[PDB]
Structure 1
Amino acid sequence: MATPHNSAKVGDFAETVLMCGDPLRAKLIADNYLENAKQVNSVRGMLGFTGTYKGKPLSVMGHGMGIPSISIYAEELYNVYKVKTIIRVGTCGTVDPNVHVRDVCIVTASGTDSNVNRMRLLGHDFPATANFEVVSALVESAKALNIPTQVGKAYSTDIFYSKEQGLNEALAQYHFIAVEMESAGLFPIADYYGARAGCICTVSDHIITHESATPEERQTSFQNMIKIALEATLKL
Structure 2
Amino acid sequence: ATPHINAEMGDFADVVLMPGDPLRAKYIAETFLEDAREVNNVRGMLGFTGTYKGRKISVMGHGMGIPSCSIYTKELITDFGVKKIIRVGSCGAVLPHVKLRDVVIGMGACTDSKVNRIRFKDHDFAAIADFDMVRNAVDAAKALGIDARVGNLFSADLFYSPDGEMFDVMEKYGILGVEMEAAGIYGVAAEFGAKALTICTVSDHIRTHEQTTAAERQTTFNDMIKIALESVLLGDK
Q: Report TM bin, short chain.
A: over 0.9
Partner residue in 2 for 1:211? 210
When structure 1 is superposed on structure 2, of 8-17 and 160-169 the one drifting more is 160-169
Closer, same or farther in 2 for the Cα pair 1:88/1:143, shift >3 Å?
same
2:121 equivalent to 1:127 = no
Unpaired segments of 5 or more residues in structure 1? none
TM-score under structure 2 length normalisation: 0.95
Using the alignment, how far apart are the partners of 2:4 and 2:14 within structure 1?
Answer: 19
When structure 1 is superposed on structure 2, of 210-219 and 15-24 the one drifting more is 210-219
Using the alignment, how far apart are the partners of 2:24 and 2:212 within structure 1?
Answer: 18
Partner residue in 2 for 1:199? 198
CA contact (8 A) 2:95 2:175 kept: yes
**What number of residue pairs does the alignment pair up?**
235
Using the alignment, how far apart are the partners of 1:159 and 1:177 within structure 2?
Answer: 18
Closer, same or farther in 2 for the Cα pair 1:76/1:177, shift >3 Å?
same
2:22 equivalent to 1:20 = no
Using the alignment, how far apart are the partners of 1:227 and 1:123 within structure 2?
Answer: 38
Deviation of 1:53 (Å) = 0.4
Deviation of 1:215 (Å) = 7.5
Using the alignment, how far apart are the partners of 1:34 and 1:120 within structure 2?
Answer: 36
Using the alignment, how far apart are the partners of 1:28 and 1:94 within structure 2?
Answer: 24
Partner residue in 1 for 2:136? 137
Partner residue in 1 for 2:172? 173
Deviation of 1:25 (Å) = 1.0
When structure 1 is superposed on structure 2, of 223-232 and 203-212 the one drifting more is 203-212
Deviation of 1:213 (Å) = 4.0
Partner residue in 2 for 1:57? 56
Specify the SS of the correspondent of 2:234: coil
Using the alignment, how far apart are the partners of 1:25 and 1:220 within structure 2?
Answer: 6
Unpaired segments of 5 or more residues in structure 2? none
Using the alignment, how far apart are the partners of 1:147 and 1:92 within structure 2?
Answer: 17
Using the alignment, how far apart are the partners of 1:126 and 1:219 within structure 2?
Answer: 32
Closer, same or farther in 2 for the Cα pair 1:107/1:82, shift >3 Å?
same
Q: For 1:117-168, what per-residue CA distance to the aligned partner results, in whole angstroms no more than 9, with x for missing partners?
A: 0000110000110110111111010100111111110001111111213101
Counterpart residue identity of residue 183, structure 1:
A
Deviation of 1:108 (Å) = 0.8
Using the alignment, how far apart are the partners of 1:36 and 1:217 within structure 2?
Answer: 24
Deviation of 1:214 (Å) = 6.4
Identity %: 57
Partner residue in 2 for 1:111? 110
Specify the SS of the correspondent of 1:227: helix
Counterpart residue identity of residue 130, structure 2:
N
Using the alignment, how far apart are the partners of 2:229 and 2:49 within structure 1?
Answer: 13
TM-score under structure 1 length normalisation: 0.95
Taking only aligned residues, the RMSD between alpha carbons, in angstroms, comes to 1.6
Closer, same or farther in 2 for the Cα pair 1:13/1:38, shift >3 Å?
same
Partner residue in 2 for 1:77? 76
